[PDB]
Subunit: 489 residues, 4 copies
């Protein structure tokens, strides 16, 4: 079971790495029709499985859920959810053999066990679907030649997928067809119909590839999404305490800061997030970010490089086979950090206060997101892909920390993201120690007084921020999506 | 002699009004060589005359000054300056008859008397140069058919055209050829060489026309440049005083405020000027500006329309023929004004304070500048011309007020600009009275406190500011010009 | 009843002349809804009236036809067509008083008589609709203040309007709202709904103005569409005969040539039409076109100028009031020309033969269409407008000539177009006499031998053709429309 | 010494492969001044060496030639040429030790022996220049760390770089700095001054890299430039003969056909080359080209992949070490070929006849050029590089065949290009056998008659031709270069 990406030569790798194309609304004229009157069987009934299923049934598709025998006998939540929503439910043996499309909506770490049990039961020329590409790409799962393999990957959790669909809208979605498995050349038609049936074509669909989705997803989560938020949380909390800030106040500042500042990010990219600062604070935030980018570039590059080479996934899967020893160890250490155990301040912290007292947090967001984006683009990944696996997802991850700290983040995300996070975090914390030691008053925990700044410098900083390539694609893609949302009224 | 613009039909008017083309560097490969070995004679040795002459001689041209006999006999400053700097000086009869190029650098109000005295002395196929097109366009001066008529109009005062040249640089420059007077088709060759001899091709040269230059200049100066600064100065000082501001402090606020805020405008357009405010102050300046634009639009449109139709210049020239009765009456009334007679505070007003306490002033600049620009573009004038006759020139006019108040502005500018100012200002002041009566705290004379603002609103305001056509063309032009500067130095 | 365009000042004229905006498909989300449950009454039941009505009824609107009392009593075709299609039919008195939208679909020359009879019967706040703007713009018809005046103008004859609608598609359409008559500000909503109900939003809708539609329509028909085709037909037929070509063969060459060559024009603009020639023939066609453009420019300019000034329509309406004396005289002379009376060749003329024997015809098409376009754009009209009133309409007019010669063209088109045609034709024929006298072998009636040409010249000619502004907007607009058609499948 | 490209990971490879930036004129403001007062020593006085040296001395640089002692003693042409032209000439020991810049202008196959002999003589911090990057990239030559390593690669033969310079012009030029050897960060300064001293900045200079230059050069030469011309020459001559064409006439058709059709390619890209055909012939060349591309794509991709992986150059260098056994065997077999031994017709073949009777040849140029370009761009090479190593260079290679057939091409080009050619050609010939067997009349050796073609099809073919990425970038680059020429002359 060799890593699939590694069986490809440079030209072949680039061809897939660079696959990303925001699709025309027109391209989905046939809607879900191609799948009408065919048997669609979802494996598992979890977050994505139930919610994609609800949407697809509403779109006219025949959906049923294949569960393990013991899931049915034990009345697992999956079986209860499926049956209470009036779906047909059965065993692999009763449902897989007739299925035209088998949709694998189980946790990624489990995909080998699932695919290997399900394939032999699938009829000739049936299609196998994934919502994430790790199994095909990193594991190198071999799919029987006559089977068509496709991906439809919503960029939101299942509940949002269902909710947006109900209100006549939907969620941005990525699609792909695995070229080793498109024997009848119907991959795209199946994927487009599946995507349309979940409502994706209402919000924007990107034609991509298993390889691009996987490589960019891993880079984003390891560096900016989880790695940086964890490293940043520990560094900043420790620094605040070390400089005399009340621990409970420091813990709340950090717990809710990322969420507050990334909400400006969600609304208008790095540009708006920086704009919420006073002018002198913006200039300082910009400079801190530049120093951060310079210090962290080799680390971000190492991560992209290991992701590309297969060294990342190979190393992690060795931990999987050794009972997640390293994961569990790092998770335990994480749960013992001062920030994770700190008491939480009780009084109010005003919205602007998170910005003004979090100059360094803003700079860490900017530096990490730009570095992740640049390093991906430098590795053959297209801007749009890099954007969706970095800046786009940041606010949601910030939300989890707000809910229940690093603990909540690390249980909400996949084992792959968690492991990825620790690998980065435990390198990045030591790395930034000298840097943290030289912070200046105003950098963290105290507002930098608004006031006069040099006209030229202000102009140059504003221009440097908004002209960053991630701000340009961001402004464009958010523009598309806003337009789509408006149309759906 | 009839207004020249009015002898043209719509198509012909449009062809002229819309002439404006930023010229390529390579169009000046010949430099000043077309004028080498030729006799260039400048009439009147004043601000433009001496300084353009200095540059042209340094560029290898043969430059002499033709003065009136009494100017020589009385040793006027013009005669002093020319002979001091080692130029040949003579009477019209001595120098004009052999002139290949006669450059008229006397005040615009005097052009008819100058042109009608110099024409009969000019040899066959000579050329007549202007640096402003009022005499040709509005007066309708008729120029002997064998004479070629061209314009080279630096966009900066004489002292600056000299010092930039000495620095190996130059000043943005407009050129034009009057199509009724180009019998050899050599107008453009003459104009380009004259412009290059002054150093304009080192900065940027625009191919324009007598008509576009005049109509846009008149509109910029009477609305945004002088009218709005005069109307705004009076309105704001009176309102500061009315609401309890110490008069001497109010007068300093207004006297130096325009210069301080437009320094930002100079460096980075309306964008940078607004960026200097706190976020809540910015949102409020933007709103005030929109209200202002709505209220002033009919007045601005009236001024453009009267400029287009010739009603403005005919009305003004009737005043010329009536011993400037209206001009002088308006000038006197301006001198008895509260702002013009107020004591001046000698104490300190910090740079940021002019922005923070001048929210309404900033809104007036934005509104006036945008409105003038829009109204011009709606009248067949190209963006670049509209930009150069409004936003570009505003910082210099603000500097005059900083020096010696409205008195200084009205004596520094031409009688045409001054009359235009009053005509506008005396209508705009009463027009805005209800508006001033409804100002809220923070609008003028007191800072609006920095703080939180809605994310979306801030994003949208920032986008609306920088996406304005005057901001887009301004960012482009300042770009070209900044690039050229780096080459030259 | 003063010409409306002439009551406007330059800025006001340009604002309307330049109104042209291909609209977003999204802008028509409400479809015909705004008119649902309102009373729509069409006046007349002719070509546009019946076919727009059929479409609008199918779209859910309440359509009825108001006829003159005697049209009903005499059982005119209008009454028969309306009733056989099951429409409600009545007198002005019975239908107008309750109408929410009265749609004037009578011949333009008749509009004063119609509007003046219908207005007094229209309730307060009702809307009056036109499909052509001549009445409002040139005649200056005054519409009661409370009435909303809008235009919806399909760019195809009624039958095509109905036919394209039936097959789920439609026809490119122009809309406008007369600013003197939009008291409730509902003009655009009414016009958009009317346009959508006829199917226009399926093919492309342009937001324009009465003034732009009228001025560009008149220029197109007078010069390239009818004027040039008539002048060209007479010049070429006479030249062929004069040089020995069999008259019957010459008459067929000319009768069917325009149609054949403009079919390439319809498919791919001037670019494709020229591409159908051999290389040497293309180079010659290009050169002839350049000479033509130079000879004809003053004439095309005169026509645009008279159209703009109101001199065209004023002069024509003086003929109207003098019983169309000049029209009838020119029409009679036209019917006596050699081409109009020539016998028609019986044998076959191959498709390529029309191209190869019609080098001069191709050059006349190119020169006339480019000149009409350039002259319109020079007069404040937007490219898209100029395109739709010139190149776009050429093939249809070529078709009429093919059917039944100049006679057919001049009876198919409005009296306004016919008069316009003669005014141009009778100037253009004499004008081109010297030019026709110097034609070379191959220019007309004989193929120019295919073969070698200079590489550079060929490149330059190809580039000069396809880079013409009319070829750029053409390629773009045909691209939009093709896309729209594809979507409608 | 290991292949340098292979020591890099994907990200690092991509950074190099994708380096290509057309440089601004202003980047060369300093001209050659960075090298003034320095000692420049060229090793080997051959085609590039003498001619670059002539330009550099004229540009004010201090140029001397370092020859082997035996070259001086034996009075080789190199020694003759240098002393004839008045240059200092010495041994390595005399000139190298004080050299600031040692420019290696010996044949690429000899670079290892040259570099390893010259390095030990070079003083500390000296610079080593190449004009092709094979030694650094593929051989992996290791250069003393204190030595700066740069490349200046004119895109034209030496005689042309000399004569363009004399004309005040120059030749498009690639520059690069090897990142493993830039200890003072002065590489770019050295490279830019050397390029300017040769006159490259007068035409156009691209900032590229050793890696991009090598990989693209190798790919262009073995597929389109030499391989395709050799495979095409043999295939076409044999098919002409097989089908009854007189052999001597067939050999002239092929010998001079490539040069004649690529003259059009030189002047205006594939666009102009296709335009020279009749419409029906054009449609057929286009179709043949598409079929060819489909058939050859795996072969082209194989060549790129082997070039990327190092398999090509390692395979070739094993042949170098085996006394060029494969090269010589392929060379000999090429000489016994029917085309190479055919008699030559002395009679006339008209220019247009090479196009008309060479439809297949034109299709082969189109297909090969596009395929090579596409395959390179798919491999991380930028369009501009891909353009300059294929289409740009094709006319010159065609000229060699016109002179003395495949014999002349294979002796004029390097051993690397020749070996690359054979490796490709001997696979492509048998590959295309079934294709040649199914040719239709008109495909080769006889004109396809001009005539009518479907309008839409012609439009679409013309669009597909000119919209190809190689045509778009080609039109842009030839534009820049044409503009620069006009300035210089
Ligand atoms: N034709 C075209 O290609 C296009 C035309 N248009 C516009 O559409 C409008 C209608 O044109 P079209 O359909 O050709 O018109 P028609 O010639 O087909 O109109 C026929 C109808 O108009 C009625 N009519 C004529 N004169 C009067 C009058 N004096 N009073 C009352 N009714 C009268 C006739 O009444 P009755 O039945 O009693 O005889 C008849 O019912 C025009 O403004 C035209 O410019 C717009 C786009 C394309
Ligand atoms: Mg992700
Ligand atoms: Mg993920
Ligand atoms: Mg001015
Ligand atoms: Mg002025
Ligand atoms: Mg028309
Ligand atoms: Mg018409
Ligand atoms: Mg090459
Ligand atoms: Mg080479």
């Amino acid at each position: 079971m060799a890593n699939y990406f590694n069986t490809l030569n440079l030209r072949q790798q680039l061809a897939q790495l660079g696959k990303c194309r925001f699709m025309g609304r027109d391209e989905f004229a046939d809607g879900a029709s191609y799948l009408q009157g065919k048997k669609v069987v979802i494996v598992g009934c979890g977050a994505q499985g139930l919610n994609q299923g609800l949407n697809m049934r509403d779109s006219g598709l025949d959906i049923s859920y294949a569960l393990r025998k013991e899931a049915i006998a034990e009345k697992r939540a999956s079986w209860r959810k499926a049956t209470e929503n009036g779906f047909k439910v059965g065993t692999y043996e009763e449902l897989i053999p007739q299925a035209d499309l088998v949709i694998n909506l189980t946790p990624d770490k489990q995909h080998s066990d699932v695919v290997r049990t399900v394939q032999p039961l699938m009829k000739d020329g049936a299609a196998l679907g994934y919502s994430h590409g790790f199994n095909i790409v990193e594991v190198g799962e071999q799919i029987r030649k006559d089977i068509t393999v496709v991906m439809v990957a919503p960029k939101c959790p299942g509940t949002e997928v269902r909710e947006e669909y109900k209100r006549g809208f939907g969620v941005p979605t990525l699609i792909a067809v695995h070229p080793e498995n498109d024997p009848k050349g119907e991959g795209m038609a199946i994927a487009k119909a599946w995507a349309a049936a979940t409502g994706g074509h209402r919000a924007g669909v990107l034609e991509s590839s298993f390889v691009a989705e996987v490589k960019s997803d891993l880079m984003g989560e390891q560096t900016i999404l989880c790695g940086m938020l964890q490293a940043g949380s520990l560094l900043c909390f420790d620094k605040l305490v070390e400089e005399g800030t009340d621990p409970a106040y420091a813990e709340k500042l950090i717990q809710f800061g990322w969420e507050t500042i990334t909400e400006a990010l969600k609304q208008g990219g790095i540009t708006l997030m920086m704009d919420r600062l006073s002018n002198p604070a913006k200039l300082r935030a910009y400079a801190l970010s530049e120093q951060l980018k310079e210090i962290m570039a080799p680390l971000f590059q190492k991560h992209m490089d290991d992701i590309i080479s297969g060294e990342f996934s190979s190393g992690m899967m060795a931990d999987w086979a050794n009972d997640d020893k390293k994961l569990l160890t790092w998770r335990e250490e994480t749960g013992k950090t001062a920030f994770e155990t700190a008491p939480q301040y009780e009084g109010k912290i005003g919205e602007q206060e998170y910005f003004d007292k979090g100059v360094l947090m803003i700079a860490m967001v900017k530096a990490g997101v730009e570095l992740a984006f640049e390093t991906m683009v430098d590795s053959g990944i297209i801007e749009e892909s890099a954007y969706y696996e970095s800046l786009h997802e940041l606010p949601l991850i910030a939300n989890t920390i707000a809910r229940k700290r690093l603990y909540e983040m690390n249980v909400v995300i996949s084992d792959t993201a968690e492991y990825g996070n620790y690998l980065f975090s435990y390198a990045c914390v030591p790395l930034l120690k000298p840097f943290m030691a030289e912070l200046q008053p105003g950098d963290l925990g105290k507002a930098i007084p608004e006031g006069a700044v040099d006209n030229g410098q202000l102009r140059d900083v504003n221009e440097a921020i908004r002209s960053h390539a991630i701000e340009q694609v961001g402004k464009k893609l958010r523009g598309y999506m806003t337009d789509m949302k408006r149309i759906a009224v």
